[model samples]
Target: SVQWCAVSQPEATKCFQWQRNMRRVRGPPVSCIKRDSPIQCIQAIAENRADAVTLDGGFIYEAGLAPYKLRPVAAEVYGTERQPRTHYYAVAVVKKGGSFQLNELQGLKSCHTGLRETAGWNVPIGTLRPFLNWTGPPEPIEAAVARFFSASCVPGADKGQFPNLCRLCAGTGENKCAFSSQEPYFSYSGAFKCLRDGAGDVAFIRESTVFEDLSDEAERDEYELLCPDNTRKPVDKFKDCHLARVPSHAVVARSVNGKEDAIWNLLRQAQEKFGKDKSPKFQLFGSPSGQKDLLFKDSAIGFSRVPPRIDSGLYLGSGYF
Candidate 1:
């Protein structure tokens, strides 16, 4: 039996049902394990308490390091239904005709998905490192960001430790900077909403977020992307204006013998039988009500086997770090 770690109870329930359905078809059996966060899932897999978990690209790098030593067995492909891809763009967004360009971001109020997330922190912060002038290292990265922006909403930050980073979060009292949607400006949509509501001057988010939140062309037209080259572009031109093209999220498994092949077999069969629009009672990629991307991207129609030699650094790209 394979043990899979799910990031939430709903995801765990879906995983358990998938395991049961696989058993009915005579496929290898899996046991669902619940975890509260991606970090917890990584630790569970590392300590042998769990065998596999799906991880965002940020966690994939953390999982690939010492102690955990995990590897990517399958990658989630995302994009349009007809143009699924293994990567997405990280971009900074501001309202169209905003006075500032990428080079002029200082003194503005900023919104982020969360600290340490790919599109939210790492990509944007890395790109802005040179502009954030200060004494380096030992000082928290959030300190520099706080000094750069007048006020900000960086969810997942400890308000006591970095009060300025959480100053703009819409959560009440202690909920400020809460990692998930509890903080009104927590995820891709939340960050964009922050921008739309004029709470933030710039929102660090992914390319698809604006389209997902602003369905009306006029509403979308009100926003523009801040390219790394100190220029702006329409939302649809993200391919040329993006900060970075990041690798897709991946399903990670331990490097031990037999585990990789077993996981690939199980995932391949499950996706084939229960992927989007396939299964009636259960769907491998559909989120439960009030949830999003429960275990995998809902747009993912299938999984692609990752080459055995492709470790997390290679998978996420060296430039990302």
Candidate 2:
């Protein structure tokens, strides 16, 4: 049995269902371990309490850091088999009416999916570094972002301590600016909603956000993408407008004795049987209602094995770190 780490209680429910369904299909046996967050799940895997967990680029970065040293065995593939894309684009999205370009974003309201997140913070921060006037640490990189934008809904930020960063956040009470899904504006689609609803002037998100949320292609024209070149482009032109090209989310396990073969075996079988519409009873790539990207990306078509020579650092590349 492969022990899977689930980051939230709700995710634990999904994992349990996965376990039951895998059993019903007589596939490889599975087990689920519940953790409150990705960090804890990383610790659990490192300590031998769990076997594996899928992680976003940032969490994969953390998992590969000292004291954990996990490695990705497989990656989520988004595009169709005819033209599979194993990576995603990080882009800055803005309302079309705005005449401002990427360089003119100072003092504007912004929405970030999460602090330190790959697409939301890492890529955008690096691209905007020239304009931030931030030298280095001691002042913390976030302080610069707080001062750069007039207001923002940057979830996963320290709310009380960095009140300026959380001002545009719409969450109430404890949910406000929360680091988890409890916060209303906490993911790709959520961040896009913040911009679309006028809560923010721009939203830092993945390139897929607009298309996934907008049912009618005509409505897509209402938003535009901000490119680092100080130009704006239509949403579909993300090929040229994206801030960075990042590795997709991956399933990570301990570097030593991580059961790579077994993990890969289970994942291949799971994807073959449960991947996107393969089985309506239990969708491996689907999240429950009111949730987004649980365990895996909803749009994922299948999993791609990582080369044995590639560690986390090699997978993410220098640009990302």
Candidate 3:
């Protein structure tokens, strides 16, 4: 039996389907557990309360840290079955008419996918480290971020600690700035909406987020990618204008006695039977019309079994850790 951690209700719903489908095919039955944030999911997995959760490079950095040591057991691939890619680009997106450069981002309203998300937080923050003037660990980075930007829609940030950081968040009540799907601005598309709707001047997201959401190529022309070199480029020019080339999201579990064999076995079977367009009733990589990227990236092809020797640090590489 495996207990897969879900970040939200929809993810749990999809996980429930996965559990049912696994049983339908006679694979090891997996159970779904719910958590509001990736950090919580990581904690649950580390304590053996849950077996696994998918995470980005930033959470990979956190999960690899002390107290809750976990490891990447599988990686999400975006390329073809024969040529799987485990890396993507992080970029700062802005409206084409904007005059501000990357280094001049101070005091601007910003949008991020979530607090600990890869392109949303870690890579963007590190790229702006020189402007942050932070002294490191004794003080929280959130504090510096709050002081730097005029306001931000950083889902999953502790609203109690830094309310300004959540000032631009559109969610209300418990959903307000939530790390889960409840928040209006909780992921790549949501953060892009924050920028598109004029709530924020800049949005931190991956390179392809623009094209994925906007069906019209002309609509994409309204946006520009802010390069680290202080110049702006077309959204398609992410290779020349981006923050970091981070590792892909991965399935993480406890380093000590993690259910590696079961997890891998279940995944292999699930992919072969339900991945992408394999099934008409329940698609492993497909979410409903309104929702996107629930259990795993909608664009992801399948899981690549990570080497047993590779942990989060090794998977993320030194540049990320």
lDDT of 3 by residue, 1-321 (tens): 889999889899999989899888888778999987888898889888999998887888889888888999999988567777788899999988979999889999999999878899888887888899799897889999999999999988888899878999998887798887777888999999899999999999998799888999899999999999999999988988898888889998888889799999888888888887788877888888779898788867888889977977789887652
lDDT-based ranking, best first?
3, 2, 1
Q: How high is the CA lDDT of each candidate model?
A: 0.83, 0.87, 0.88
Candidate 3 TM-score to native:
0.93
| Worst 10-residue lDDT window, candidate 3 | 312-321
Model 1 global lDDT (CA atoms, 0 to 1): 0.83
Clashes of each: 0, 0, 0
Instruction: Give RMSD (Å) of candidate 1 vs. truth.
Output: 2.3
Superposed Cα deviation of residue 70, candidate 1 (Å): 1.6
Clashes of 2: 0
Q: Which stretches of candidate 3 lie above 4 Å from their native place?
A: 80-83
Model 2 spans > 4 angstroms off:
none
Cα lDDT of model 2 by residue, 1-110, tens digit: 78999988778888898889899998987789998778889999999999999988998898999989999989999966788999999999999977899999899898
